[PDB]
């Protein structure tokens, strides 16, 4: 059911987000402590403000996952000019065994650990943001994600979302009885009609993460 996969996914997304920040050098290696999750070595941040920022973000995603209202969670890497330079897209599906999915989840971690060998180096001084693509028909009502008053979300703009002539690097795909998920990276090369079924609700936290 929705609450079981919500717990599992948010636990996993926190780990994966921490790791992405490490391997893409968004924060210095010196803030990261090695740990083990799903029997794989991971890097977790010890920066309490960064950690709270990631937990607040995922605390707003979690009730959306519980209602099966999440299509994508995306970590965007922005260069110091605030242009997206990399996107880590977690495409999530909950169709209508845990130790099996933890082994399946572990595979995502392993592929993130090697993406720095295929992704080209990021310019210095990148920051990150998170995008959430929801599932239900798109309207301007944000109330379902505004679950923390002091952690506001704002609707994303085309510039926030759509990468410029992107190189596509899939990392990992899983299929399970209760969860299907695809992780891929978009790397920068370096009609708007109301009835359009491609219309999307996409939101990002208004607050920026702690500077590095």
PDB file of C-alpha atoms in Angstrom:
ATOM      1  CA  UNK A   1       0.000   0.000   0.000  1.00  0.00           C
ATOM      2  CA  UNK A   2       0.929   3.650  -0.293  1.00  0.00           C
ATOM      3  CA  UNK A   3       2.310   4.198   3.198  1.00  0.00           C
ATOM      4  CA  UNK A   4       4.704   1.223   3.025  1.00  0.00           C
ATOM      5  CA  UNK A   5       6.317   2.359  -0.226  1.00  0.00           C
ATOM      6  CA  UNK A   6       6.311   5.944   1.052  1.00  0.00           C
ATOM      7  CA  UNK A   7       8.437   4.988   4.073  1.00  0.00           C
ATOM      8  CA  UNK A   8      10.769   2.859   1.947  1.00  0.00           C
ATOM      9  CA  UNK A   9      11.193   5.453  -0.802  1.00  0.00           C
ATOM     10  CA  UNK A  10      11.787   8.497   1.423  1.00  0.00           C
ATOM     11  CA  UNK A  11      14.418   6.587   3.398  1.00  0.00           C
ATOM     12  CA  UNK A  12      16.003   5.692   0.053  1.00  0.00           C
ATOM     13  CA  UNK A  13      15.673   9.157  -1.491  1.00  0.00           C
ATOM     14  CA  UNK A  14      17.446  10.758   1.482  1.00  0.00           C
ATOM     15  CA  UNK A  15      20.377   8.370   1.069  1.00  0.00           C
ATOM     16  CA  UNK A  16      20.483   8.852  -2.694  1.00  0.00           C
ATOM     17  CA  UNK A  17      20.279  12.647  -2.434  1.00  0.00           C
ATOM     18  CA  UNK A  18      23.132  12.750   0.085  1.00  0.00           C
ATOM     19  CA  UNK A  19      25.185  10.534  -2.216  1.00  0.00           C
ATOM     20  CA  UNK A  20      24.495  12.605  -5.323  1.00  0.00           C
ATOM     21  CA  UNK A  21      25.640  15.726  -3.471  1.00  0.00           C
ATOM     22  CA  UNK A  22      28.834  13.854  -2.559  1.00  0.00           C
ATOM     23  CA  UNK A  23      29.790  12.339  -5.906  1.00  0.00           C
ATOM     24  CA  UNK A  24      28.870  15.495  -7.791  1.00  0.00           C
ATOM     25  CA  UNK A  25      30.866  17.583  -5.289  1.00  0.00           C
ATOM     26  CA  UNK A  26      28.037  20.020  -4.537  1.00  0.00           C
ATOM     27  CA  UNK A  27      29.236  20.192  -0.908  1.00  0.00           C
ATOM     28  CA  UNK A  28      32.838  19.521   0.215  1.00  0.00           C
ATOM     29  CA  UNK A  29      33.919  15.960   0.947  1.00  0.00           C
ATOM     30  CA  UNK A  30      34.761  17.192   4.452  1.00  0.00           C
ATOM     31  CA  UNK A  31      31.098  17.408   5.471  1.00  0.00           C
ATOM     32  CA  UNK A  32      30.459  13.745   4.596  1.00  0.00           C
ATOM     33  CA  UNK A  33      30.807  10.663   6.791  1.00  0.00           C
ATOM     34  CA  UNK A  34      30.899   7.190   5.268  1.00  0.00           C
ATOM     35  CA  UNK A  35      28.120   4.799   6.300  1.00  0.00           C
ATOM     36  CA  UNK A  36      26.500   1.630   5.018  1.00  0.00           C
ATOM     37  CA  UNK A  37      22.945   1.391   3.694  1.00  0.00           C
ATOM     38  CA  UNK A  38      21.482  -1.624   1.881  1.00  0.00           C
ATOM     39  CA  UNK A  39      24.919  -3.185   2.528  1.00  0.00           C
ATOM     40  CA  UNK A  40      26.563  -0.603   0.238  1.00  0.00           C
ATOM     41  CA  UNK A  41      29.029   2.139   1.260  1.00  0.00           C
ATOM     42  CA  UNK A  42      27.337   5.553   1.210  1.00  0.00           C
ATOM     43  CA  UNK A  43      28.358   9.108   2.134  1.00  0.00           C
ATOM     44  CA  UNK A  44      25.952  10.930   4.470  1.00  0.00           C
ATOM     45  CA  UNK A  45      26.212  14.633   5.287  1.00  0.00           C
ATOM     46  CA  UNK A  46      26.845  15.806   8.853  1.00  0.00           C
ATOM     47  CA  UNK A  47      25.797  19.387   8.020  1.00  0.00           C
ATOM     48  CA  UNK A  48      22.695  19.680  10.235  1.00  0.00           C
ATOM     49  CA  UNK A  49      21.098  22.462   8.197  1.00  0.00           C
ATOM     50  CA  UNK A  50      21.645  20.598   4.929  1.00  0.00           C
ATOM     51  CA  UNK A  51      20.241  17.440   6.510  1.00  0.00           C
ATOM     52  CA  UNK A  52      17.148  19.276   7.757  1.00  0.00           C
ATOM     53  CA  UNK A  53      16.635  20.809   4.318  1.00  0.00           C
ATOM     54  CA  UNK A  54      16.610  17.362   2.730  1.00  0.00           C
ATOM     55  CA  UNK A  55      14.334  15.964   5.427  1.00  0.00           C
ATOM     56  CA  UNK A  56      11.868  18.861   5.133  1.00  0.00           C
ATOM     57  CA  UNK A  57      11.740  18.406   1.352  1.00  0.00           C
ATOM     58  CA  UNK A  58      11.036  14.691   1.682  1.00  0.00           C
ATOM     59  CA  UNK A  59       8.494  15.285   4.464  1.00  0.00           C
ATOM     60  CA  UNK A  60       6.411  17.136   1.847  1.00  0.00           C
ATOM     61  CA  UNK A  61       6.927  14.411  -0.763  1.00  0.00           C
ATOM     62  CA  UNK A  62       5.954  11.631   1.653  1.00  0.00           C
ATOM     63  CA  UNK A  63       2.166  12.261   1.870  1.00  0.00           C
ATOM     64  CA  UNK A  64       2.203  12.643  -1.913  1.00  0.00           C
ATOM     65  CA  UNK A  65       3.832   9.209  -2.250  1.00  0.00           C
ATOM     66  CA  UNK A  66       1.239   7.827   0.176  1.00  0.00           C
ATOM     67  CA  UNK A  67      -1.533   8.948  -2.208  1.00  0.00           C
ATOM     68  CA  UNK A  68       0.364   7.674  -5.280  1.00  0.00           C
ATOM     69  CA  UNK A  69       0.613  11.255  -6.499  1.00  0.00           C
ATOM     70  CA  UNK A  70       4.311  11.378  -7.441  1.00  0.00           C
ATOM     71  CA  UNK A  71       5.623  10.794 -10.944  1.00  0.00           C
ATOM     72  CA  UNK A  72       9.164  12.128 -10.472  1.00  0.00           C
ATOM     73  CA  UNK A  73      11.503  13.334  -7.766  1.00  0.00           C
ATOM     74  CA  UNK A  74      14.400  15.190  -9.387  1.00  0.00           C
ATOM     75  CA  UNK A  75      17.676  16.480  -7.956  1.00  0.00           C
ATOM     76  CA  UNK A  76      18.778  19.399 -10.150  1.00  0.00           C
ATOM     77  CA  UNK A  77      22.403  20.587 -10.084  1.00  0.00           C
ATOM     78  CA  UNK A  78      22.605  24.316 -10.875  1.00  0.00           C
ATOM     79  CA  UNK A  79      25.825  26.026 -11.889  1.00  0.00           C
ATOM     80  CA  UNK A  80      26.835  29.236 -10.138  1.00  0.00           C
ATOM     81  CA  UNK A  81      24.749  31.100 -12.746  1.00  0.00           C
ATOM     82  CA  UNK A  82      21.604  29.249 -11.514  1.00  0.00           C
ATOM     83  CA  UNK A  83      21.231  27.312 -14.798  1.00  0.00           C
ATOM     84  CA  UNK A  84      20.510  23.573 -14.451  1.00  0.00           C
ATOM     85  CA  UNK A  85      23.613  21.642 -15.460  1.00  0.00           C
ATOM     86  CA  UNK A  86      22.632  18.091 -14.332  1.00  0.00           C
ATOM     87  CA  UNK A  87      19.354  16.403 -13.392  1.00  0.00           C
ATOM     88  CA  UNK A  88      18.989  13.117 -11.524  1.00  0.00           C
ATOM     89  CA  UNK A  89      15.425  12.002 -12.340  1.00  0.00           C
ATOM     90  CA  UNK A  90      13.741   9.405 -10.116  1.00  0.00           C
ATOM     91  CA  UNK A  91      10.795   8.254 -12.224  1.00  0.00           C
ATOM     92  CA  UNK A  92       8.459   6.471  -9.808  1.00  0.00           C
ATOM     93  CA  UNK A  93       5.422   4.233 -10.404  1.00  0.00           C
ATOM     94  CA  UNK A  94       3.233   2.469  -7.838  1.00  0.00           C
ATOM     95  CA  UNK A  95       1.109  -0.077  -9.749  1.00  0.00           C
ATOM     96  CA  UNK A  96      -2.440  -0.654  -8.440  1.00  0.00           C
ATOM     97  CA  UNK A  97       9.507  -8.580  -1.012  1.00  0.00           C
ATOM     98  CA  UNK A  98      11.367  -5.932   1.029  1.00  0.00           C
ATOM     99  CA  UNK A  99      14.764  -7.673   1.200  1.00  0.00           C
ATOM    100  CA  UNK A 100      14.316  -7.981  -2.556  1.00  0.00           C
ATOM    101  CA  UNK A 101      13.648  -4.259  -3.017  1.00  0.00           C
ATOM    102  CA  UNK A 102      16.490  -3.319  -0.659  1.00  0.00           C
ATOM    103  CA  UNK A 103      18.747  -5.361  -2.918  1.00  0.00           C
ATOM    104  CA  UNK A 104      17.083  -3.608  -5.865  1.00  0.00           C
ATOM    105  CA  UNK A 105      17.467  -0.238  -4.140  1.00  0.00           C
ATOM    106  CA  UNK A 106      21.146  -1.003  -3.443  1.00  0.00           C
ATOM    107  CA  UNK A 107      21.682  -1.278  -7.204  1.00  0.00           C
ATOM    108  CA  UNK A 108      20.671   2.375  -7.590  1.00  0.00           C
ATOM    109  CA  UNK A 109      23.228   3.389  -4.941  1.00  0.00           C
ATOM    110  CA  UNK A 110      25.970   1.461  -6.757  1.00  0.00           C
ATOM    111  CA  UNK A 111      25.197   3.168 -10.074  1.00  0.00           C
ATOM    112  CA  UNK A 112      25.208   6.615  -8.467  1.00  0.00           C
ATOM    113  CA  UNK A 113      28.616   5.734  -6.974  1.00  0.00           C
ATOM    114  CA  UNK A 114      30.029   5.319 -10.515  1.00  0.00           C
ATOM    115  CA  UNK A 115      28.228   8.110 -12.369  1.00  0.00           C
ATOM    116  CA  UNK A 116      31.144  10.481 -11.826  1.00  0.00           C
ATOM    117  CA  UNK A 117      33.116   8.245 -14.255  1.00  0.00           C
ATOM    118  CA  UNK A 118      30.686   8.935 -17.119  1.00  0.00           C
ATOM    119  CA  UNK A 119      29.338  12.388 -16.213  1.00  0.00           C
ATOM    120  CA  UNK A 120      31.812  15.110 -17.144  1.00  0.00           C
ATOM    121  CA  UNK A 121      33.057  17.317 -14.310  1.00  0.00           C
ATOM    122  CA  UNK A 122      30.728  20.068 -12.993  1.00  0.00           C
ATOM    123  CA  UNK A 123      31.884  23.687 -12.896  1.00  0.00           C
ATOM    124  CA  UNK A 124      32.880  24.786  -9.398  1.00  0.00           C
ATOM    125  CA  UNK A 125      30.305  26.328  -7.115  1.00  0.00           C
ATOM    126  CA  UNK A 126      27.167  24.411  -8.071  1.00  0.00           C
ATOM    127  CA  UNK A 127      24.114  24.310  -5.827  1.00  0.00           C
ATOM    128  CA  UNK A 128      21.115  22.005  -5.948  1.00  0.00           C
ATOM    129  CA  UNK A 129      17.354  22.092  -5.882  1.00  0.00           C
ATOM    130  CA  UNK A 130      14.634  19.420  -5.958  1.00  0.00           C
ATOM    131  CA  UNK A 131      11.702  19.145  -8.399  1.00  0.00           C
ATOM    132  CA  UNK A 132       8.546  17.121  -7.735  1.00  0.00           C
ATOM    133  CA  UNK A 133       6.299  16.126 -10.670  1.00  0.00           C
ATOM    134  CA  UNK A 134       2.934  14.996  -9.349  1.00  0.00           C
ATOM    135  CA  UNK A 135       0.407  12.679 -10.994  1.00  0.00           C
ATOM    136  CA  UNK A 136      -3.113  14.117 -10.777  1.00  0.00           C
ATOM    137  CA  UNK A 137      -4.454  16.521 -13.406  1.00  0.00           C
ATOM    138  CA  UNK A 138      -2.415  19.733 -13.292  1.00  0.00           C
ATOM    139  CA  UNK A 139      -3.921  22.804 -11.628  1.00  0.00           C
ATOM    140  CA  UNK A 140      -2.410  25.794  -9.846  1.00  0.00           C
ATOM    141  CA  UNK A 141      -3.563  24.547  -6.430  1.00  0.00           C
ATOM    142  CA  UNK A 142      -0.424  23.711  -4.432  1.00  0.00           C
ATOM    143  CA  UNK A 143      -2.116  22.893  -1.136  1.00  0.00           C
ATOM    144  CA  UNK A 144      -1.228  19.173  -1.311  1.00  0.00           C
ATOM    145  CA  UNK A 145       2.518  19.943  -1.119  1.00  0.00           C
ATOM    146  CA  UNK A 146       2.417  22.983   1.196  1.00  0.00           C
ATOM    147  CA  UNK A 147       2.434  20.749   4.279  1.00  0.00           C
ATOM    148  CA  UNK A 148       5.141  22.725   6.155  1.00  0.00           C
ATOM    149  CA  UNK A 149       4.254  26.408   6.485  1.00  0.00           C
ATOM    150  CA  UNK A 150       7.858  27.522   6.859  1.00  0.00           C
ATOM    151  CA  UNK A 151       9.048  25.244   4.026  1.00  0.00           C
ATOM    152  CA  UNK A 152       7.150  26.726   1.075  1.00  0.00           C
ATOM    153  CA  UNK A 153       7.061  25.252  -2.396  1.00  0.00           C
ATOM    154  CA  UNK A 154       6.730  27.335  -5.544  1.00  0.00           C
ATOM    155  CA  UNK A 155       5.725  26.265  -9.053  1.00  0.00           C
ATOM    156  CA  UNK A 156       8.721  25.601 -11.312  1.00  0.00           C
ATOM    157  CA  UNK A 157       9.345  27.459 -14.562  1.00  0.00           C
ATOM    158  CA  UNK A 158      10.498  26.033 -17.902  1.00  0.00           C
ATOM    159  CA  UNK A 159      13.991  27.357 -17.073  1.00  0.00           C
ATOM    160  CA  UNK A 160      13.951  25.464 -13.765  1.00  0.00           C
ATOM    161  CA  UNK A 161      13.092  22.160 -15.437  1.00  0.00           C
ATOM    162  CA  UNK A 162      14.005  21.607 -19.055  1.00  0.00           C
ATOM    163  CA  UNK A 163      17.681  20.967 -19.715  1.00  0.00           C
ATOM    164  CA  UNK A 164      19.432  22.418 -22.767  1.00  0.00           C
ATOM    165  CA  UNK A 165      20.175  19.793 -25.482  1.00  0.00           C
ATOM    166  CA  UNK A 166      20.669  17.099 -22.850  1.00  0.00           C
ATOM    167  CA  UNK A 167      22.934  14.082 -22.928  1.00  0.00           C
ATOM    168  CA  UNK A 168      20.966  11.169 -21.464  1.00  0.00           C
ATOM    169  CA  UNK A 169      22.654   8.678 -19.093  1.00  0.00           C
ATOM    170  CA  UNK A 170      20.385   6.020 -17.569  1.00  0.00           C
ATOM    171  CA  UNK A 171      21.719   4.674 -14.282  1.00  0.00           C
ATOM    172  CA  UNK A 172      19.344   2.041 -12.929  1.00  0.00           C
ATOM    173  CA  UNK A 173      15.894   0.598 -13.519  1.00  0.00           C
ATOM    174  CA  UNK A 174      13.993  -1.666 -11.164  1.00  0.00           C
ATOM    175  CA  UNK A 175      10.723  -3.521 -11.423  1.00  0.00           C
ATOM    176  CA  UNK A 176       9.118  -4.896  -8.300  1.00  0.00           C
ATOM    177  CA  UNK A 177       5.748  -6.178  -7.224  1.00  0.00           C
ATOM    178  CA  UNK A 178       4.925  -2.904  -5.437  1.00  0.00           C
ATOM    179  CA  UNK A 179       7.323  -0.354  -6.970  1.00  0.00           C
ATOM    180  CA  UNK A 180       8.775   0.420 -10.374  1.00  0.00           C
ATOM    181  CA  UNK A 181      11.471   3.075 -10.584  1.00  0.00           C
ATOM    182  CA  UNK A 182      13.916   4.484 -13.131  1.00  0.00           C
ATOM    183  CA  UNK A 183      16.918   6.694 -12.395  1.00  0.00           C
ATOM    184  CA  UNK A 184      18.630   8.566 -15.205  1.00  0.00           C
ATOM    185  CA  UNK A 185      20.767  11.682 -15.574  1.00  0.00           C
ATOM    186  CA  UNK A 186      20.312  14.528 -18.004  1.00  0.00           C
ATOM    187  CA  UNK A 187      23.594  16.358 -18.491  1.00  0.00           C
ATOM    188  CA  UNK A 188      23.851  19.728 -20.197  1.00  0.00           C
ATOM    189  CA  UNK A 189      25.875  19.618 -23.424  1.00  0.00           C
ATOM    190  CA  UNK A 190      28.174  22.275 -21.936  1.00  0.00           C
ATOM    191  CA  UNK A 191       1.825  25.185 -27.796  1.00  0.00           C
ATOM    192  CA  UNK A 192       0.582  25.986 -24.304  1.00  0.00           C
ATOM    193  CA  UNK A 193      -3.066  24.957 -24.506  1.00  0.00           C
ATOM    194  CA  UNK A 194      -5.042  24.197 -21.361  1.00  0.00           C
ATOM    195  CA  UNK A 195      -6.424  20.920 -22.663  1.00  0.00           C
ATOM    196  CA  UNK A 196      -2.981  19.445 -23.423  1.00  0.00           C
ATOM    197  CA  UNK A 197      -2.651  16.059 -21.632  1.00  0.00           C
ATOM    198  CA  UNK A 198       1.090  16.699 -21.274  1.00  0.00           C
ATOM    199  CA  UNK A 199       0.341  19.577 -18.861  1.00  0.00           C
ATOM    200  CA  UNK A 200       2.342  19.008 -15.649  1.00  0.00           C
ATOM    201  CA  UNK A 201       2.272  20.168 -12.030  1.00  0.00           C
ATOM    202  CA  UNK A 202       5.957  20.681 -11.121  1.00  0.00           C
ATOM    203  CA  UNK A 203       7.023  22.345  -7.845  1.00  0.00           C
ATOM    204  CA  UNK A 204      10.345  23.094  -6.091  1.00  0.00           C
ATOM    205  CA  UNK A 205      11.133  24.365  -2.584  1.00  0.00           C
ATOM    206  CA  UNK A 206      11.190  28.150  -2.542  1.00  0.00           C
ATOM    207  CA  UNK A 207      13.981  28.109   0.056  1.00  0.00           C
ATOM    208  CA  UNK A 208      17.462  27.345  -1.202  1.00  0.00           C
ATOM    209  CA  UNK A 209      19.711  24.773   0.533  1.00  0.00           C
ATOM    210  CA  UNK A 210      22.576  25.965   2.753  1.00  0.00           C
ATOM    211  CA  UNK A 211      25.492  27.382   0.807  1.00  0.00           C
ATOM    212  CA  UNK A 212      28.712  25.346   0.779  1.00  0.00           C
TER     213      UNK A 212
END
